[PDB]
Amino acid sequence: LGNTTSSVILTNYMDTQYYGEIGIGTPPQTFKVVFDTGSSNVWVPSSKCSRLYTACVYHKLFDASDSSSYKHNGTELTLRYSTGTVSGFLSQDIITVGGITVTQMFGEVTEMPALPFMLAEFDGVVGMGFIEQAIGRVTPIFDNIISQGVLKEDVFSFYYNRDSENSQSLGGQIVLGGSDPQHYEGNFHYINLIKTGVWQIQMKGVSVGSSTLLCEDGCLALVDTGASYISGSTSSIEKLMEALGAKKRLFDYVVKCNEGPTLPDISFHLGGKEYTLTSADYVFQESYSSKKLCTLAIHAMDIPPPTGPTWALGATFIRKFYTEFDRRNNRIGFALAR
Amino acid sequence: LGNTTSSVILTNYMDTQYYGEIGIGTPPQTFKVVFDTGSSNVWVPSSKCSRLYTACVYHKLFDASDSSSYKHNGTELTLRYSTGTVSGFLSQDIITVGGITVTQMFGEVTEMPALPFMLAEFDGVVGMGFIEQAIGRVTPIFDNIISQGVLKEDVFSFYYNRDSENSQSLGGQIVLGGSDPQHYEGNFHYINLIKTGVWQIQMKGVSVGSSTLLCEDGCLALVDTGASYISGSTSSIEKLMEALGAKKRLFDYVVKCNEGPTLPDISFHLGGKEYTLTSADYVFQESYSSKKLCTLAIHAMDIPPPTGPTWALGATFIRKFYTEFDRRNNRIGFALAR
Amino acid sequence: LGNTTSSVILTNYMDTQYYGEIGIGTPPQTFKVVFDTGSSNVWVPSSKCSRLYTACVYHKLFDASDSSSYKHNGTELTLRYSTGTVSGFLSQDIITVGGITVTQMFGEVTEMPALPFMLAEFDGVVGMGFIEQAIGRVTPIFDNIISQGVLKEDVFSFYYNRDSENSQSLGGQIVLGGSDPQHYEGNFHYINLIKTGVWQIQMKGVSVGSSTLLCEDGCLALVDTGASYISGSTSSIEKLMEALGAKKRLFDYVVKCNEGPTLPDISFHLGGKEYTLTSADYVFQESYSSKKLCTLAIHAMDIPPPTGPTWALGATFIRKFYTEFDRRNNRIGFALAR
Amino acid sequence: LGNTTSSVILTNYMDTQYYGEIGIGTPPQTFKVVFDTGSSNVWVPSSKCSRLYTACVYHKLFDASDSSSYKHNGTELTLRYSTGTVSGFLSQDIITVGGITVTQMFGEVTEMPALPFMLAEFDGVVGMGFIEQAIGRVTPIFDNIISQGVLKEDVFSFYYNRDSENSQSLGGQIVLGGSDPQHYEGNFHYINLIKTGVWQIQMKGVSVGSSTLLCEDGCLALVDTGASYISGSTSSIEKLMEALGAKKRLFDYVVKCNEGPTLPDISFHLGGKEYTLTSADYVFQESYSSKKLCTLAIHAMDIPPPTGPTWALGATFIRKFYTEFDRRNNRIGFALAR
Amino acid sequence: LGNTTSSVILTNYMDTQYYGEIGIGTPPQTFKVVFDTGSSNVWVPSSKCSRLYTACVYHKLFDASDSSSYKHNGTELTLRYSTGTVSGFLSQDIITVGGITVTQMFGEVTEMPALPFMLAEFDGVVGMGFIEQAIGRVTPIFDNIISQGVLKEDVFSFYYNRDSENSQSLGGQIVLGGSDPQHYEGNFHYINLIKTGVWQIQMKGVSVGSSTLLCEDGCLALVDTGASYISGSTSSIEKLMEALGAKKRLFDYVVKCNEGPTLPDISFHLGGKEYTLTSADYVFQESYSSKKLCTLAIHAMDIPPPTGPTWALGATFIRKFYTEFDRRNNRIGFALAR
Amino acid sequence: LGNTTSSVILTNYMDTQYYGEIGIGTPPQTFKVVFDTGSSNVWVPSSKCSRLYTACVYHKLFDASDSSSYKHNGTELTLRYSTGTVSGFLSQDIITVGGITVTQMFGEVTEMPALPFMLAEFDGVVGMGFIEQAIGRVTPIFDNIISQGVLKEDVFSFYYNRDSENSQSLGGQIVLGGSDPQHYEGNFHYINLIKTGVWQIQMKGVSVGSSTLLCEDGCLALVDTGASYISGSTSSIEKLMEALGAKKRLFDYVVKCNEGPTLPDISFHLGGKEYTLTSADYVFQESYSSKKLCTLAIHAMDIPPPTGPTWALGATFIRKFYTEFDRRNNRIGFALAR
């Protein structure tokens, strides 16, 4: 341990994508990345990404030939998420994350599909997960930063803000090595991980207003900074949505915008505490008109073993509760807001 | 040289005006002022300003008749900024800035144009530039603070925050006599002034996306805490804006609001570091609508000789990079703001 | 009879709620109320309304202990509407309605459900119906005002305006004791009530364009100032909507906004006259785009005996036709506009 | 004392300017003027106003050279309002106000600032305040009308309507010598002036929702027909706005438009009655959008001694309460407008 | 052939109607008309159009009695389009089209249905089709203009612009007698007509991204300047929409607005070339929100023999490709843009 | 009389300002100027303009001290337009307009009001009116060009384009000594000037839809290239706007944006031709929203004797009709622009 922290300011795109800058190379090539506790690899698109993929013409590409600290590896890799898949090869270089500099093995991505990566405002991903789930067992970036012995504590924290058209306010902030009390209130309460290797905790029930109608007898909750939404299994979400009176439009679940504020609180029972989102927290009140339909920030996602079936607590949850991921103690701390 | 630093808390109005409070006279008459490295005089509006100047109706007015420590001078002065002019006369009184008290000659302004000053939340200006550029050869406030030999270093530093809808967020901060490590990370990187007497450095190139398409044979950068935006020559900005796909209007440049988030990076090559802004840093993202127009915090400003032609790096730039102004070593230092 | 009238200016919320001020107590506690010909009791929320109900934390509460004219009664009551139900107890106090002061028994409401009363911009309800339908046979407020012998005529009238974003114009007006010719044109034509005790008239047919396709052989029409919409039985409305080419979205019936103006007039045959709404009168033209769906201000409502089955002519109808409720003659007068 | 009352019809521009017509000279030159209880001088723009004052280009100009009943005076005068200043010189001529003809000294204004006067639909001002506050000790118009002994009572009354998109709606009305019972209901309630010479009364408290949180040890209220809004001291309004959740901008305070309708009541305790405004009365509701900002008709205005510190009750207040100004008994009467 | 061209500037209404001015009569009565290669008759509404039809009260009517060049014919005619039907009688008069004057037989229309002609922003139609499909074998207007021998070439061209809220730019342009290179780039490539008498060409396939999944083994394509959209048979469009992942909302096919840019190019194989529309060309991106649904500018239309079954390439196609209809050579030329 | 024509390319700013470049002095100092048939003097802003005139800070300033061909005069002058006034003094220098060089007396302007000139993209004005209306009897530029006997005809012509978002579109064009057949079609139609000395013709009537409801006994039309709009007397425009259903605001008239496209034609009867504008020609269609307000390019302007009362036909009109100004025959010719 040392005496420093490093923060990275995040851009909020439409409350569904949150990303910040890293630099790769000497001199640094700068990319927009999602900092993702739900995966463990660092990747960006390659200058060798063939321009067949519209996604690669529309994102910043890493040119290894322009860095005097680049070292070749070549080993191939396929990274696949629950919503999309990328593929490429391993390279080594220096990565700057809020003026921490760290030598890191990462993926230069050469196959990058339009679905979904044309919708991505970010270029790549910095996996904040554990080595146990890293592809190619490449040492994750946070472990390499812990190895430097500069960070005040072996934790990192996430603030995700609510988007506003009347402010140019920060979209979010990640702090490596600690937390920022400006963005939460009170004190952390922690829930221990079921096992090291995944940012996943036991959940003891999910209530809709007055009744634990879901997850009686327990279920799993991934805390996923790379997911836009709160997610459940298709069956859990069907039942949640019936309880709310929301219905599947064509693609998504909606409520009449005026009735949004009549919807019940949703509480997630974690570590003896109730983490409660109100309807204002989980419905996109694009308006409050009785003539308009409004979407909810909750979706089905059937996550396969070994990680799933599980709920995923993504940006929707994180906007409400500032989150501290504690590697030393294998636990996740939450605090409100702000 | 002593052992003092004073900080002044600043208010951020709409990401365009940053100002703090000074007290003039006995008893103190308080004023909201911009601390401005692009000018070297102090002024506030005067009680002798005709109320046919509506700007004077809408601001705090120094009344000499209520100050027991006032000393008459009466010498005429006119101050010219690129967006407007003020005129009045010189007076001397005691000024408090962050618990430092200094006897100072300042302008009492009696002619204060509606455009731009009806649009100012601030009342006046504290010039932080050098005596060389002082109108009427009046000794600047920072030279007079140095002469007291209380300050630890002959330096001052600026932190400009992003806008907030929260009361708790600090709008910004000036430190007299040092820098605040709580608002920057990594290390300072320093560029020497072309010449003492102006806060202007050499700029080695401006790149927009993946091309050094501007300032290719070097140019000038004024580091200007009193400017809201980044500015360049009309021809430089025309070229810059062609590359962004932006439309020129009367006073600004706009893009379609849906286009904003995906506009390219802009980098400024200063003293052997690239200083990169993303679109989130220079677009006022107020909507994601394809039907609406979103302003960029970059504009044309043709500054004349001897200082210009020059780029000016204002609040758009300083928000991302904590800035230290070093009078001892005639240099400017940048570090990543937090 | 006397020589006075009393008017109360109404706020229009989104063309679906219309409410104005009454004061209760000495000194007066002011509430927002809907003036409702479809019920006969006065009620407001109580200071004794337990804060379990989010609705009670979000509405103004009557504190009996702060009125020197309050007299206890205690008798309990349940008031239930077609869309929601309230419950509480009877109290007596002085109620001011446009500077008429009247001693009135009313309900202090202690049970107030979030569905629908969290959507209510009004606090309570002033029932303008007859004693025959009053709960607890509490003398309705208008009968108590008639008893004073101050009103020029034993009638009351309603103006409901169309909402506009470009005006701060009156939302509506109720006149006790007469009418306001500024808000209608021409002369009233009256339809007699089927029976005293309910504001309900015989309807002789409903035509969609050129054909009385509905209510041949007669049907009932409640004139209901407490209802947002024109309503029919589920079967009547299914057939009306098929005739218009409107369809059930998920929650509501919609048309493409561009096709709104192609929809046929709807005429209600009352008292030998045709009361005609055009499509502009019954469709919420939130836009006129061929890319957008627009909702209609007509809904199904199966009203149970003894009052139903019946149509209900609520705000949608009243916006078109200024309405005079004539207690002396047991009839309802209509006139256009304006 | 005689048997005449004259009414003047007023135009309502956007709920912010209320003005009627006077005729000056022989033949009459007509002017749109605000009748203003917060000032005691009459002025109109002069033909001698330089056309470099754009405000003079855009208004009606009195030309002395076309009036056979003009009498020269020529004494300089300056008039200062809280939002701007006019300057010119004194002239005498015949003025007709509602079919009363009076010989009157008025200001011919030759200096008329673009801000605020380019934004005025009106040309000039008829001061209805007392001689005590008259600049240059000029006898006010109402004192000269009283001296004719034609008026029934030494009183005048104001009715300010809500805005309308209809041509038929009367914008407002001033009655000279009485009040119009057609535009108020219930009874007048009277408060005595602190002192003759100013239309200022004692205010006993200002409450926001269910709490007397302002003016708790009493304060001052100017009843100001020439002001658009209700105003308080900066500190009073900061506190008021904190309680409403409103954001301060340059010239106004805003809330999110969806929040407007549910903002609390504001009450003004005047002479043993509470005068209550709902949010519909003080919010310019232009939209119900969560993304838009809606202005409040309440602002900060620090009026200096001897008149201030004071609240000012302008058109926001007068729209709800018909106001009678009684010079005989040095009092102000309020009744509920209709 | 002569040496002139005639252009007519078109108004773009919502990207779905395009119309320009013609004058009929001496002196000219001016009408808004769609210039329609998909029909061959000229018609406008008649002054003799009974006002039963709301469409006729809402459009400009031709009064024969006010023209000194009107000559009676009387022969009746019914014109029916794929979306609506009109009926009336033949008249002769002088028609001015961009200052070409031509004696023309046209239909005075006396039966004009609200569906769809109440939605029409245009008054009438100028059929640019061949005599073979003219009703009453009335010589089409372009043949009568060719007969004058004034036009530089026996062709006419169409430019249709994309609508913009930030410009008052031209909606479109038709050029009789040639083309305007300001509105296309590069050189025409032509496809020959299957047969003279219809503006219809052979199509050799329609691909969605990478695969000719439609129209393998050939199909027909009408080039129809009177159609808003690209259309196919119901079966072709069902399959196209499944391939895109679009679905039938209630009335129309939609995609989530954010996913619009992920949709594949659509290429129409005509004359050995691929005419490619991107998703930006065929989806109405009224927004790009993940919370909103967006409609496509492609619809089913089962066109009956002898002309159909066929695709129709209407405004959606024409916006992308500037179109030259070449009567001399019986072919259609296309060029991009602009 | 010689054989030269010169064209000057104009820039279209927002359909409201049309201007081209002139060069003054040796070496040339370039200025953006409106070519204005409604005035007869040339002026540009002067370097002697006080920078307390913010308009002068924001425009190009003629500096006599940098011109070797300058000749002093110094005579004061003031120029009055209907929307503002400029003042300064006379100077002589060489002016180039489209490759014609002429020695010219012009105004150096030292007083330049913020309103309207802060809103001008142009710097100054080239008066194209007659010597009769020249302030200070200064010979107008076109009289001095004629005296060189280089021009083919004693005429000049104006083309004003519609606005564009394209760079390639020419904003407009003035031809000195002829007309450009590339920008008009059909034949010119000529009206003789009421009198030489003003570009004013007789107008025989103004019709709105199907009724000559204005200028029924004849009136005056100034053909004014320096005016943005069509203007009439206040009373004429009130009547015109009543017929359009438009609302009057401070500086303009608006309709609901959805109403814009269906507003009636307006025709101007000039010399035995009707000149017809559709709503597309005089509405700034920025939206089709029922909630938004759309400005008309028609306004009230009361021009005084001897020139007025008069209508003025500005850019709204000239955009549709190519205009030739014939000094040889004292007439104005119109043809349909293309």
Name the features.
mainly beta, six-stranded mixed beta barrel, five-stranded mixed beta sheet, 338 residues, glycoprotein (chains A, B, C, D, E, F), membrane (chains A, B, C, D, E, F), 6 helices, homohexamer, Cathepsin D, subunit A, domain 1
Could you explain the architecture of this structure?
- Chain A has six helices and 24 strands.
- The first copy, chain A, is mainly beta.
- Chain A has two domains: 5-179, Cathepsin D, subunit A, domain 1, CATH 2.40.70; 180-337, Cathepsin D, subunit A, domain 1, CATH 2.40.70.10.
- A six-stranded mixed barrel of chain A has the order 2-3-8-4-7-6. In chain A, strands 12-14-22-15-21 form a five-stranded mixed sheet.
- Chain A is globular and about 60 Å long.
- The interface between A and B is medium-sized, with 28 and 27 residues.
- Chains A, B, C, D, E, F: It catalyses: Cleavage of Leu-|-Xaa bond in angiotensinogen to generate angiotensin I.
What assembly state would you assign to the polypeptide chains in this entry?
Answer: homohexamer
Q: Termini separation of chain A (Å)?
A: 28 Å
Could you name the CATH class of the largest domain in chain A?
Mainly Beta
Largest interface: A-B, 28 and 27 residues
- Going by helix content, strand content and strand pairing, the class of chain A is mainly beta
Q: Please count the helical segments of chain A.
A: 6
* Strand percent estimate of chain A: 35-45%
Number of separate structural domains of chain A: 2
How is this fold's topology laid out?
Six copies of one chain form a homohexamer.
Chain A: E1 6-13, E2 17-24, E3 29-36, E4 42-45, H1 54-57, E5 71-80, E6 85-97, E7 100-111, H2 114-117, E8 124-127, H3 141-148, E9 155-160, E10 172-176, E11 185-192, E12 200-203, E13 206-208, E14 219-223, E15 230-232, H4 234-244, E16 247-248, E17 253-256, E18 266-270, E19 273-277, H5 279-282, E20 293-295, E21 298-300, E22 311-313, H6 315-320, E23 321-326, E24 331-336
EC number (chains A, B, C, D, E, F): 3.4.23.15
GO biological process, one term (chains A, B, C, D, E, F): regulation of MAPK cascade
GO cellular component, one term (chains A, B, C, D, E, F): extracellular space
